[PDB]
From a paper:
Mpp75Aa1.1 (formerly known as Cry75Aa1.1), discovered by mining the genome of Brevibacillus laterosporus, provides effective control of WCR larvae when expressed in transgenic maize. More specifically, the Pfam (Protein family) database classification indicates that it is a member of the ETX_MTX2 sub-family of β-PFPs.
The crystal structure of Mpp75Aa1.1 was solved at 1.94 Å resolution using the SAD heavy atom phasing method from a crystal briefly soaked in samarium acetate. The protein crystallized in tetragonal crystal lattice of space group P4322 with one molecule in the asymmetric unit. The Mpp75Aa1.1 structure revealed an overall elongated shape with approximate dimensions of 112 Å x 26 Å x 22 Å with a high prevalence of β-strands. The molecule is composed of three structural domains. Domain I, corresponding to the head region of the molecule, displays a non-contiguous fold encompassing four alpha-helices (α1-α4) and six short β-strands (β1-β3 and β14-β16). Domain II, at the center of Mpp75Aa1.1, is characterized by a set of anti-parallel β-strands running longitudinal across two-thirds of the Mpp75Aa1.1 structure, and a two-stranded anti-parallel β-hairpin (β9 and β10) which amino acid constituents are amphipathic, with alternating hydrophobic and hydrophilic residues. Domain III, localized at the tail-end of Mpp75Aa1.1, contains a carboxyl terminal peptide (CTP), β-strands β18, β19, and β20 (β20 corresponds to an introduced histidine tag). Domains II-III adopts a topology representing the conserved structural core of the aerolysin-like proteins. Furthermore, the Mpp75Aa1.1 structure also revealed that WCR-specificity is likely conferred by three domain I residues in the β14 (W206), β15 (G217) strands as well as in the connecting unstructured loop (Y212), which are located at a different part of domain I.
Numbering used by the authors: 24 to 293, 300 to 324
Write the structure that this text describes.
């Protein structure tokens, strides 16, 4: 969905216009640029004819996007992926007479991290508007980010190929034993929601009892009045002094490696063998290649 911000600010001016005359004259005028009439129990048939001075584009002047930003919304949902086999090596103490502490090789995996977002409730602001949102990943241990385009249905996908590495581990291998070390990359994903915000300025133009040819008041004050009165639906607008803040929404998701698990098997009797030990190993991350796209 999309909010046409400029058109909604024009309707904001029309709401204040009609609502204020309805109080003044007990009429039932609707927000409109068209001439309309209404029967007042205290006044008779009354006419509302907005002049060319205020109609259409001239309902708002000094319209400006002042700032735009995006913030994490709620608690993202993290999940664990299927572990990915990374390789294996042998720790051979079959000919040794002493127990040894033997260092494993480093294991590695070439992984494509992906971050994507979708603008689900867009803001049509009259100018290309973007904002970057940051979120924690991997149970709060790293920070990631994603750039929203505020137009409805905008999608972004960013990928990085990275190399994950497990540091060498020290394994006790008893005399005469042969051990096998198998390595697996653990993965995770995250998804969540973003709030999209724009602070916009402007002056709303209405005919009114005090200004029968039209007068202008900042949109922040006009919105404050209209929300207090119940004139029109501006549920995703908030006053901010003379300006208003308008809110949209997006989604995001991301995937990444989390760590390595090493599985130690006794293969002395020769062919999988008994698992003797498992080790969680923190990975070392090195970026190789990156690619950006927007749809
Ligand atoms: Na409208
Ligand atoms: Sm909320
Ligand atoms: Sm939520």
């Amino acid at each position: 969905s999309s909010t046409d911000v400029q058109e909604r600010l024009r309707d904001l001016a029309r709401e204040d216009e009609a609502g204020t005359f309805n109080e003044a004259w007990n009429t039932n005028f609707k927000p409109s640029d068209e001439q309309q009439f209404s029967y007042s129990p205290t006044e008779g048939i009354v006419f509302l004819t907005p002049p060319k001075n205020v109609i259409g584009e001239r309902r708002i002047s000094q319209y400006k996007v002042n700032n735009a930003w995006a913030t994490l919304e709620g608690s993202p949902t993290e999940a664990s992926g299927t572990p990915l086999y990374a390789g294996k090596n042998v720790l051979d103490n079959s000919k040794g007479t002493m127990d040894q502490e033997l260092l494993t090789p480093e294991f590695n995996y070439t992984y494509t991290e992906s971050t994507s977002n979708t603008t689900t409730h867009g803001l049509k602001l009259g100018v290309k508007t973007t904002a970057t949102m940051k979120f924690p990943i991997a149970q709060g241990s790293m920070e990631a980010s994603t750039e929203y385009n505020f137009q409805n249905s905008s999608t972004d996908t960013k990928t990085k190929q990275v190399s994950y590495k497990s540091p060498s581990q020290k394994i006790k291998v008893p005399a005469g034993k042969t051990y096998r070390v198998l390595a697996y990359l653990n993965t995770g994903s995250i998804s969540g929601e973003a709030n999209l915000y724009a602070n916009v300025g402007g002056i709303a133009w209405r005919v009114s009892p005090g200004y029968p040819n039209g007068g202008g008041v900042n949109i922040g004050a006009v919105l404050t009045k209209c929300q207090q009165k119940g004139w029109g639906d501006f549920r995703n607008f908030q006053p901010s002094g003379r300006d208003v803040i308008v809110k949209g929404q997006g989604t995001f998701k991301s995937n990444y490696g989390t760590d390595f698990i090493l599985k130690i098997e006794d293969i002395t009797d020769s062919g999988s063998g008994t698992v003797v030990q498992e080790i969680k190993v923190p990975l070392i991350r090195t970026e190789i290649h990156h690619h950006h796209a927007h749809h």
